[PDB]
């Protein structure tokens, strides 16, 4: 970020990135030019000696498509909140759901992981999420160093119209009903973490009636975690079991799921870092004789070549391990290998 | 505002805010995540010793729906202008409509009241408005202290197509002919100011054929205002007359409506800020039978606390006092009370 | 632009500007209010002695509709490079088509002109473009001042569905197939010239009525005068199944000539005077040779500092009514514009 203003107990980052960013794939609807940035702004506000107020908003632009395109920008991250010392702080507005606290350990590939994957974005408490209430704690309440915790509320977001309508609707796939989440992070050692995740919220009449596949009053979530970053040595891997709450593509959502991720890398001191990944996500008790299947299942290659702290270019290779069958074919799940080349300017 | 440039003669603001925002309601269309952020731009150039010119833009971005829906920002405003010292100012782009010189004294809930209550925007020269050409005095070119007046014309924003389209085309609920409006303001003492804003409107062929209510060539609109703003206490009210310009929900538009808004607050050494308000909007001569009908009634009780200059939070209770009848349930209005909880970081 | 930022070898500058903005024509899809903005910023980070990265955005916001209008802003541009020495600079992202390098002479009048006219974007290489890695080499290799040359890569961007389909498609007005280009310019008189090849995609062959081809060319060759308060301009360029025929398809040929001529006086007055023509050949459907654009523009600016301008431009449409221009949406009518603008 640039800091663009500080004066008088007010501070004011400027950040964001351009990404020139192209895929190579068979699958068309994938392949092609992926350029896109992200702006966004940080603000904090020292109030007195043990409160500080706080802004975020991050916005992300596509760039690929005409001028003519609809629905080529949107926002990530909007919330503001306060900072209470010791004691903590609580947000609320668009924000990461508290699971992310810890499989956010994971995301950290070239240019493939993250939301999208295992869990997508508006996705009950998975990721980025409307509505979300977040009280936090560092270092719990300054007695134990290393050691974090968050608890979260979530309102329902509905449906567009008719009884399970919320202002702010939205299709079945990306709906909610009051929810929470809880998470919590540890320096078990020198540079290696452990953290614990979990979820419950409550489903909508839309997500019980108009896909075919998940049935259940509740989504639920359970996140473990580990994580090394020391000695140029970055490891982390991190286990979820869902019900009612992994996606089993445009079909629904799967009755249970069971979604793994693991990643080494290493960072060189000239600046290059490559990357080494693999991701499953397996879907279980799916209506329609579907039985157990895989939703996503890849090993990934990269590596990022960091010119600086304000500009990189990188290349990711997802090897897809997914076969075609008619699960695959009829949810519109991606089984063909892709290759990005990256060449990023961030300030 | 955040001064981010100020050099040669050339400065630029920056501001906004974030705004963490729920909305509790039995009506569906307005309960739940309520989360949007502002952000503009305003920047004014010293030209010569007796003229400067201007740019503003406003631009608000809703947070509360996904990453994949549509229609989510929006431009509040965009103009430029050049100032005269004594002669007045000329600024053209979307503004504010002048009547709202004098509505304006009332729109200062913690969060409800302003447009889309008693008058909307794009909504004749009743607030926000695209293709304004303002003309501007202060103090009465100098002779006068406390003095303000306003000249305002605005060209046809017609139909999408047919006879009646410009290039920026809309539907009839936000169509508007060629018209002008006037507004003068007189500040007696500092804090205690009377008003008076009058506009005048060609009617569209759409606003007569489409909608069932509401038939006649001519919108126009009367409004008077009185502010009592000093030692702590601000007090407010405007009584406006409206022909043909006072939209009756989806039904079209009122033939005549009266529209009356009220507000007292209060506010005290360590930040609280109390409000109470009184708003309504009643139709006359309404078709099909409706005679005369209530648009819009209701009281506000609420409050502001102010962190400081940069954040705040609030509390407002909309309690509504309007009938669910086949007037309200036919025109698409809401009956139900709303309670707001809003926590605002501003830059 | 105002550098908000410069700090340890990183620079940001913020531009844009706020354009109030009303047309006046009978021709009710021109007339009315087009005010708009325009918001960007412009990065470089210094690598080392020899290497230097940037980032550009460019961002487009309307300003003329309510709001609770759609798809009232977009990306212009939005590319990130290297630039090493003498050797050159490369950028990958939305960025301008390098015939643009040598269209851009005569893309200077006070309002019209530009893209829209003979040529659009999302137009192949002709102006701004998805997908484009650019090359470019000022002073050859810093051996012969004034001498420019481009060379420039974009790939596919194909239709929505289907197997013609790319993750970026659009209609087939907006797409194209793997295309390359080059551009040389020699500079206070100038001569440039610009060549570009695509192929076309499968849409664009079935689903407009007119033009046909596997490939899409252009030929361009420029002029410029500038020096001694006086700026003159000249481009033209022939194509072959590149030019809009309005929505009804490609001109299988066209022609197109822009030149124009202003002049700068002290106090801040620039009048303008300009012709601009697109003439296509050889149309389906009993076309056949149609004057696709056609018209004579006066206007001037006048600049009160470097960030406050006003205007007007009057746009003489010489184009006739016929079945071409009403099916094709071509719109034959006069336009008068006035503007006032705020630069940052
Ligand atoms: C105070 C100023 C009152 C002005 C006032 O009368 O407010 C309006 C009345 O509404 C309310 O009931 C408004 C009620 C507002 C409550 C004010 C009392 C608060 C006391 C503390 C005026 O309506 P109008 O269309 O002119 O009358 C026509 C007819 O006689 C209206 O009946
Ligand atoms: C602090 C500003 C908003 C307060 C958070 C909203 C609380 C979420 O409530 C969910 C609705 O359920 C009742
Ligand atoms: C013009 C394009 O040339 C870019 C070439 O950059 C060479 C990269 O060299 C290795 C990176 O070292 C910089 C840190
Ligand atoms: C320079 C800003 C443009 C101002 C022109 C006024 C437009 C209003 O006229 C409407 C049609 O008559
Ligand atoms: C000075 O000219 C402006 C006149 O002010 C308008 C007053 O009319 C409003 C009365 O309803
Ligand atoms: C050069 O002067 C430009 C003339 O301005 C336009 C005049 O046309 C207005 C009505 O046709
Ligand atoms: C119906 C499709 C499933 C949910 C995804 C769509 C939600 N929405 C409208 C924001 O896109
Ligand atoms: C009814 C008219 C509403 C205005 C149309 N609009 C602006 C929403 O497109
Ligand atoms: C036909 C071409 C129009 C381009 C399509 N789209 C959606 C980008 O506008």
Same mark, same amino acid.
């Given at each position: 970020?640039?800091?663009?203003?500080?004066?008088?107990?007010?501070?004011?980052?400027?950040?964001?990135?351009?990404?020139? *960013?192209?895929? $190579?794939?068979?699958?068309?609807?994938?392949?092609?030019?992926?350029?896109? =940035?992200?702006?966004?702004?940080?603000?904090?506000?020292?109030?007195?000696?043990?409160?500080?107020?706080?802004?975020?908003?991050?916005? %992300?632009?596509?760039?690929?498509?005409?001028?003519?395109?609809?629905?080529?920008?949107?926002?990530?991250?909007?919330?503001?909140?306060?900072?209470?010392?010791?004691?903590?702080?609580?947000?609320?507005? #668009?924000? @990461?759901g508290v699971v992310?606290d810890v499989?956010?350990?994971?995301?950290?590939?070239?240019?493939?992981?993250?939301?999208?994957?295992?869990?997508?974005?508006?996705?009950?408490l998975?990721?980025?999420?409307?509505?979300?209430?977040?009280?936090?704690?560092?270092?719990? $309440?300054?007695?134990?160093?290393?050691?974090?915790?968050a608890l979260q509320?979530?309102?329902?977001?509905?449906?567009?119209?008719?009884? +399970?309508?919320?202002? %702010?609707? #939205?299709?079945?796939?990306?709906?909610?009903?009051?929810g929470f989440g809880t998470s919590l992070?540890?320096?078990?050692?020198?540079?290696?973490?452990?953290?614990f995740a979990y979820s419950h919220?409550?489903?909508?009449?839309?997500?019980?009636?108009?896909?075919? *596949?998940?049935?259940?009053?509740?989504?639920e979530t359970y996140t473990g975690?580990?994580?090394?970053?020391?000695?140029?040595? &970055?490891?982390?891997?991190?286990?979820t079991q869902?019900?009612?709450?992994? #996606?089993?593509?445009?079909?629904? $959502?799967?009755?249970?799921?069971?979604? $793994?991720?693991?990643?080494?890398?290493?960072?060189?001191?000239?600046?290059?870092?490559?990357?080494?990944? &693999?991701?499953?996500?397996?879907?279980?008790? *799916?209506?329609? +004789?579907?039985?157990?299947?895989?939703?996503?299942?890849?090993?990934?290659?990269?590596?990022? &070549?960091?010119?600086?702290?304000? =500009?990189?270019? @990188?290349?990711?290779?997802?090897? %897809?391990?997914?076969?075609?069958?008619?699960?695959?074919?009829?949810?519109?799940?991606?089984?063909?290998?892709?290759?990005?080349?990256?060449?990023?300017?961030?300030?």
């Amino acid at each position: 970020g640039a800091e663009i203003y500080n004066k008088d107990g007010n501070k004011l980052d400027l950040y964001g990135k351009i990404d020139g *960013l192209h895929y $190579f794939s068979d699958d068309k609807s994938v392949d092609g030019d992926q350029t896109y =940035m992200r702006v966004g702004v940080k603000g904090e506000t020292q109030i007195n000696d043990q409160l500080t107020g706080y802004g975020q908003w991050e916005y %992300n632009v596509q760039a690929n498509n005409t001028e003519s395109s609809s629905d080529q920008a949107w926002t990530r991250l909007a919330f503001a909140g306060l900072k209470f010392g010791d004691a903590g702080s609580f947000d609320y507005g #668009r924000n @990461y759901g508290v699971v992310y606290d810890v499989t956010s350990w994971t995301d950290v590939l070239p240019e493939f992981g993250g939301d999208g994957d295992t869990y997508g974005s508006d996705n009950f408490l998975q990721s980025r999420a409307n509505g979300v209430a977040t009280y936090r704690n560092s270092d719990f $309440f300054g007695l134990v160093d290393g050691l974090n915790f968050a608890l979260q509320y979530q309102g329902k977001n509905g449906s567009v119209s008719g009884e +399970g309508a919320t202002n %702010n609707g #939205r299709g079945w796939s990306k709906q909610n009903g009051d929810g929470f989440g809880t998470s919590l992070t540890y320096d078990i050692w020198d540079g290696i973490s452990a953290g614990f995740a979990y979820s419950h919220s409550k489903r909508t009449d839309e997500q019980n009636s108009v896909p075919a *596949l998940g049935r259940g009053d509740n989504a639920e979530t359970y996140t473990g975690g580990l994580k090394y970053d020391a000695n140029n040595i &970055y490891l982390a891997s991190q286990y979820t079991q869902t019900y009612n709450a992994t #996606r089993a593509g445009s079909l629904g $959502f799967a009755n249970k799921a069971q979604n $793994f991720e693991v990643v080494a890398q290493y960072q060189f001191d000239f600046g290059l870092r490559p990357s080494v990944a &693999y991701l499953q996500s397996k879907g279980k008790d *799916l209506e329609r +004789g579907y039985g157990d299947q895989d939703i996503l299942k890849y090993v990934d290659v990269g590596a990022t &070549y960091y010119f600086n702290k304000n =500009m990189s270019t @990188y290349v990711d290779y997802k090897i %897809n391990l997914l076969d075609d069958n008619s699960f695959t074919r009829n949810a519109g799940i991606s089984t063909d290998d892709v290759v990005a080349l990256g060449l990023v300017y961030q300030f």
